Design an enzyme around this catalytic site. Structure first.
Site, PDB file in Angstrom:
ATOM      1  N   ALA A 108      50.998  91.737  34.516  1.00 31.23           N
ATOM      2  CA  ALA A 108      51.527  92.070  35.831  1.00 31.23           C
ATOM      3  C   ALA A 108      52.914  92.686  35.721  1.00 31.23           C
ATOM      4  CB  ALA A 108      51.571  90.819  36.710  1.00 31.23           C
ATOM      5  N   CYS A 137      60.712  88.678  29.103  1.00 34.07           N
ATOM      6  CA  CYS A 137      59.475  87.978  29.399  1.00 34.07           C
ATOM      7  C   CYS A 137      59.886  86.629  28.837  1.00 34.07           C
ATOM      8  CB  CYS A 137      58.310  88.494  28.548  1.00 34.07           C
ATOM      9  SG  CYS A 137      58.364  87.978  26.806  1.00 34.07           S
ATOM     10  N   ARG A 138      58.936  85.767  28.546  1.00 32.02           N
ATOM     11  CA  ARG A 138      59.265  84.476  27.986  1.00 32.02           C
ATOM     12  C   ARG A 138      59.872  84.333  26.595  1.00 32.02           C
ATOM     13  NH1 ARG A 138      57.862  79.458  26.358  1.00 32.02           N
ATOM     14  NH2 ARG A 138      57.441  78.094  28.134  1.00 32.02           N
ATOM     15  N   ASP A 172      66.704  87.741  28.669  1.00 36.18           N
ATOM     16  CA  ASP A 172      66.878  86.804  29.757  1.00 36.18           C
ATOM     17  C   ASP A 172      66.379  85.424  29.386  1.00 36.18           C
ATOM     18  OD1 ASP A 172      67.629  86.296  32.522  1.00 36.18           O
ATOM     19  OD2 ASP A 172      65.446  86.019  32.821  1.00 36.18           O
ATOM     20  N   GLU A 182      64.753  77.466  24.906  1.00 39.89           N
ATOM     21  CA  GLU A 182      64.207  77.021  26.179  1.00 39.89           C
ATOM     22  C   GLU A 182      62.872  76.325  26.048  1.00 39.89           C
ATOM     23  OE1 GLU A 182      65.242  80.013  29.510  1.00 39.89           O
ATOM     24  OE2 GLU A 182      64.386  81.089  27.790  1.00 39.89           O
ATOM     25  N   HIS A 208      68.080  83.085  32.331  1.00 37.20           N
ATOM     26  CA  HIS A 208      66.775  82.953  32.977  1.00 37.20           C
ATOM     27  C   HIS A 208      66.850  83.303  34.468  1.00 37.20           C
ATOM     28  CE1 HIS A 208      62.695  81.191  31.993  1.00 37.20           C
ATOM     29  NE2 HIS A 208      62.584  81.507  33.270  1.00 37.20           N
ATOM     30  N   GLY A 266      65.305  85.772  35.748  1.00 39.43           N
ATOM     31  CA  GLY A 266      64.194  86.691  35.962  1.00 39.43           C
ATOM     32  C   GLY A 266      63.800  86.796  37.417  1.00 39.43           C
ATOM     33  N   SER A 267      63.811  85.668  38.128  1.00 36.25           N
ATOM     34  CA  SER A 267      63.441  85.616  39.532  1.00 36.25           C
ATOM     35  C   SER A 267      64.594  85.139  40.407  1.00 36.25           C
ATOM     36  CB  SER A 267      62.237  84.704  39.725  1.00 36.25           C
ATOM     37  OG  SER A 267      62.386  83.542  38.931  1.00 36.25           O
TER      38      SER A 267
END
Ligand SMILES: NC(=O)c1ccc[n+]([C@H]2O[C@@H](COP(=O)(O)OP(=O)(O)OC[C@@H]3O[C@H](n4ccc(N)nc4=O)[C@H](O)[C@@H]3O)[C@@H](O)[C@H]2O)c1
Lengths: 330, 330
Positions: free
Chosen positions: B155, B236-237, B261, B266, B293, B295-296
């Site tokens: 996505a 991404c992760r 990020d 983590e 982190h 990201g959002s």
């Protein structure tokens, strides 16, 4: 035997090698602007000069360098040059096409993202070592769904719009001359007035040149009638945005943040001037994002700007009519 | 007699007033992670809990909270919830949809631009007061014409590609699953393999998850094969990038920069874990761009995630099967 070319600012080593074939090169080995006295002293017996934006070529300069046959500007403009003194003095003046528009559009999008997403304070918070995973902090504003106005649908204004196409935004633009039909839908932008753009936008990106006409176009008045918590992104030239009108709108919460690639302290043709960026802007790391005029600081683009000023010099010293000539010396 | 709901992390006042209609809310007034003991002492007689990424719900947790009827997690997954334990103890477990995609794709692009155009270092020099107008320094790398490569087209890799459509790059993509004909053309991205995309690319952006397969997928062997002077953007992760293989890639000039990020640090669900990000990356201010982190970390997305956690709790507390249920206890 070889003509001498003085280069006032650092250039890539390929361009010095390119120039050596037909000239002896006096480069600036530093990343520093030399003082006008040291430039004139080097150019005094130079056949050619590669000029950058700190250089102001007037009749005084040209009379101190009577062997000058060509001034090759690594610039797209000629504001800081006396074009007719160069003509009267039998000095080709040449310029280079605008290679700065894409690197400045790209950077402008960088400032928008870094400032709306608190990326600097987030980088500082990682340098400090205290990071233990996600936390509900540094919440910013997104792009998608928002309204961003471009005040100045010029070269830069265009490439910006073309580069925000995929971002599902709603783009407005306030320009004196409107655009056609095909481009206005191609890059899904819509025309509107300054009071209406400036009132109906989440992020405001001025792309107007500096004039005697539009200076402090973003002043106390303009800032007052925008959406509360908006964002101002300024990569056009310094004195278009009132850095003190935004010192107040910052503290009063009217706008959420200010990102800049230019500063009014950066304008020596202006007779109004503070020699530093406002110390309250420089201490507000939480709502500001700043770059030192890096709009066209891309290696590839600078290499090509340098290449072209060098070719202009090689053509003029060879007896040819140089390609960037905007002048006819006799 | 209002049921009690503990939220382990800060939420917007709008969410509190929403939950206040049908429960008494014990909020985290700060932006910090309460310790486990403190979460437990608050939730010991809570009927509902709103959980976040730091929370880790096991049987010990639940046995300390006996009144618990619902855990409404403000997350899209449940890797740190013992789901069957929740079922066994009679507590609903809910999640929210994935709404992180577009804010993550935009921040990845922010990370790309900021790293390549030296904007962090640019800001410091601005805040140093020593700024004196244009200089020939901080020359970075452009987007246009360069080839960027998306390792895995989920996505977020779609959202990244869709956004870069207007930047005149050459985009490749390598997922094991293919993409259909026409969307592959409106975004001008091309199928290639891992061996191909790594060979032909100045910018590498991973967009696959970690699993057992795909971790340190960017390792020494992958870094052996990319372009010299290339960039790695990892938002991404974490841990899909062998951070210390990247610490070598920088030193050997194989990578010009690393922005991320997310980190290896983590992940407590792996038997390989010190306590921090390596400070060879933390001291490298000139080649690294980091964020915690985020990201959002956009308001509209955090709000809506909190609201769906909120709604899911309200529903279950009222006797309804909560829309986000990933289980069914009795
Ligand atoms: N940071 C950098 O490194 C950098 C890089 C490149 C260039 N520059 C400099 O050159 C300009 C850029 O804009 P531009 O797109 O390059 O120039 P232009 O096409 O003339 O601008 C649009 C114009 O706006 C006009 N206008 C409209 C209304 C009005 N009342 N007066 C007007 O004057 C009119 O419509 C026209 O379209 C500034 O950024 C300036 O700092 C800086």
């Amino acid at each position: 035997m070889k003509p001498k070319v003085v280069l006032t600012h650092w250039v890539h080593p390929e361009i010095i090698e390119l120039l050596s074939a037909s000239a002896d090169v006096i480069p600036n080995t530093t990343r520093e602007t030399l003082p006008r006295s040291e430039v004139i002293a080097r150019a005094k017996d130079a056949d050619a000069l590669m000029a950058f934006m700190p250089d102001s070529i007037d009749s005084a300069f040209l009379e101190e360098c009577p062997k000058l046959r060509v001034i090759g500007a690594a610039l797209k403009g000629y504001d800081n040059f006396d074009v007719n003194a160069c003509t009267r003095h039998g000095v080709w003046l040449t310029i280079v096409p605008d290679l700065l528009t894409i690197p400045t559009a790209e950077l402008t999008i960088g400032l928008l993202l870094g400032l709306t997403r608190h990326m600097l304070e987030g980088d500082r918070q990682i340098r400090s070592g205290h990071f233990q995973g996600w936390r509900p902090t540094l919440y910013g504003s997104g792009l998608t769904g928002k309204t961003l106005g471009i005040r100045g649908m010029g070269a830069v204004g265009r490439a910006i719009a073309q580069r925000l196409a995929g971002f599902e935004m709603n783009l407005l633009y306030c320009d004196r001359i409107p655009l056609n039909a095909e481009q206005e839908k191609a890059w899904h932008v819509q025309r509107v007035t300054l009071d209406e753009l400036l009132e109906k936008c989440d992020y405001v990106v001025p792309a107007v040149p500096m004039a005697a006409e539009t200076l402090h176009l973003i002043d106390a008045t303009a800032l007052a009638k925008m959406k509360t918590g908006s964002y101002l992104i300024n990569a056009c030239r310094g004195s278009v945005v009132d850095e003190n009108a935004v010192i107040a709108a910052l503290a009063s919460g009217k706008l959420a943040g200010y990102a800049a690639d230019v500063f009014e302290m950066e304008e020596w043709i202006r007779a109004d001037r503070p020699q530093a960026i406002p110390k309250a802007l420089l201490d507000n790391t939480a709502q500001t994002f700043f770059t030192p005029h890096l709009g066209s600081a891309v290696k590839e683009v600078r290499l090509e700007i340098e290449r072209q000023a060098a070719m202009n010099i090689i053509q003029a010293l060879a007896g040819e009519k140089p390609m960037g000539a905007i002048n006819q010396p006799y």
